[PDB]
Structure 1
Amino acid sequence: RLNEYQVIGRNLPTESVPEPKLFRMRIFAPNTVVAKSRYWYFLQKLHKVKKASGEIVSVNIISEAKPTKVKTFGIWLRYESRSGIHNMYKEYRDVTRVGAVETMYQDLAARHRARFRSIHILKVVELEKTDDVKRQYVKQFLTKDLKFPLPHRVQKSKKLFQATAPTTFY
């Protein structure tokens, strides 16, 4: 269960450099302790800065703009497998940016055995145009007048024994 955070940090000011540049990252983390931890993890992949020589300036939750609008998200990924490092791009249907990332973490765990530690989120983009959708497993839900049944419904029973024959209509 994740949240999207805006984390802003900078190098500690010096008499040489008293206003270092402020860098922001959007972090998908379960809580604010991991959000500031993940921030320093990525700054040390790019900038000559450390947690000992730096400073966290702001941590803020980024809420969904239209949390009850159904969207299609494209997520660009860079994950590590048992053998190498790979770039990937996948698409998810959800109403929040965070909920697509939660589906993403479940999805790469299941099909590629990629743990949380092995995944970098390069970019999450809401696809405005139906022509922006490249993947067929989410494009099939953008067809006009979409209808489908749910055959073979299995009902969960509170009791061990039922006195009537089971059914699966729905």
Structure 2
Amino acid sequence: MKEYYITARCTDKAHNPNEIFRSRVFAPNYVVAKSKFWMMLKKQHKVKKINAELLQCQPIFEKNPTVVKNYQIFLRYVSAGGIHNITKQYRDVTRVGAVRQMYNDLASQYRTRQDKIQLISITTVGDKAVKNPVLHQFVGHHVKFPMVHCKPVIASKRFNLPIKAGKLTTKLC
């Protein structure tokens, strides 16, 4: 999952060649980003690739991929019944990192595959605007929990024997 900045213009009778269409598209690569970008133009402004020129398709990186932020993804997906608008909150350090979480959450809770979800916008909310019941318990400064029933950690697959000698124990960790 990567984020791209794509611009283009339409040069034909219908559209003046002075209107630039910008976008911020989350795509696995840059070929998919243009594919998403063109369909947005075709379904909204009747602009087709045969009558348009791309200008700049540059990757966008996180300025501070070390600061924890609370996100708020506004999205619309298609179900068996109809189309719905949903808002989901996520905690991550990168914009692209949170989007992959949204895709994995949507595909599990709602069983909605990737070719039904359209991301309208993604912003950053404060520490009190989180409304997810599970995620609201981890925004405070005084949060602590004893991680228990830990499986003992193996340093690497090198020491992973199939049969072990002696009893096996879990960890208060």
TM-score, normalised via structure 2 length: 0.90
Cα separation, 1, equivalents of 2:73 and 2:140: 22
State the 1:167 CA deviation.
1.0
> Is 1:75 equivalent to 2:73 in the alignment?
yes
Cα separation, 2, equivalents of 1:137 and 1:20: 48
2:137 to 140, 146, 154: 140
Query: Aligned partner of 1:112: which letter?
Result: Y
Contact 1:13 1:20 (C-alpha < 8 Å) held by counterparts: no
Please name the residue that 1:164 is paired with: 166
Contact 2:10 2:16 (C-alpha < 8 Å) held by counterparts: no
Distance 1:60 1:35, change over 3 A: same
SS of 2:50's partner is: coil
RMSD: 1.6
Please name the residue that 2:10 is paired with: 11
Q: How does 1:39-58 map to 2 (within 5 A)?
A: 39-58=37-56
State the 1:84 CA deviation.
1.1
* Same amino acid, percent of matched pairs: 41
List alignment gaps of at least 5 residues for structure 1.
none
Cα separation, 2, equivalents of 1:135 and 1:8: 35
SS of 1:39's partner is: helix
State the 1:13 CA deviation.
5.2
List alignment gaps of at least 5 residues for structure 2.
none
SS of 1:134's partner is: coil
Please name the residue that 2:150 is paired with: 153
CA deviation profile, 1:87-134 (whole Å, cap 9, x unmatched): 10001110000000001111100011111110000110011x223222
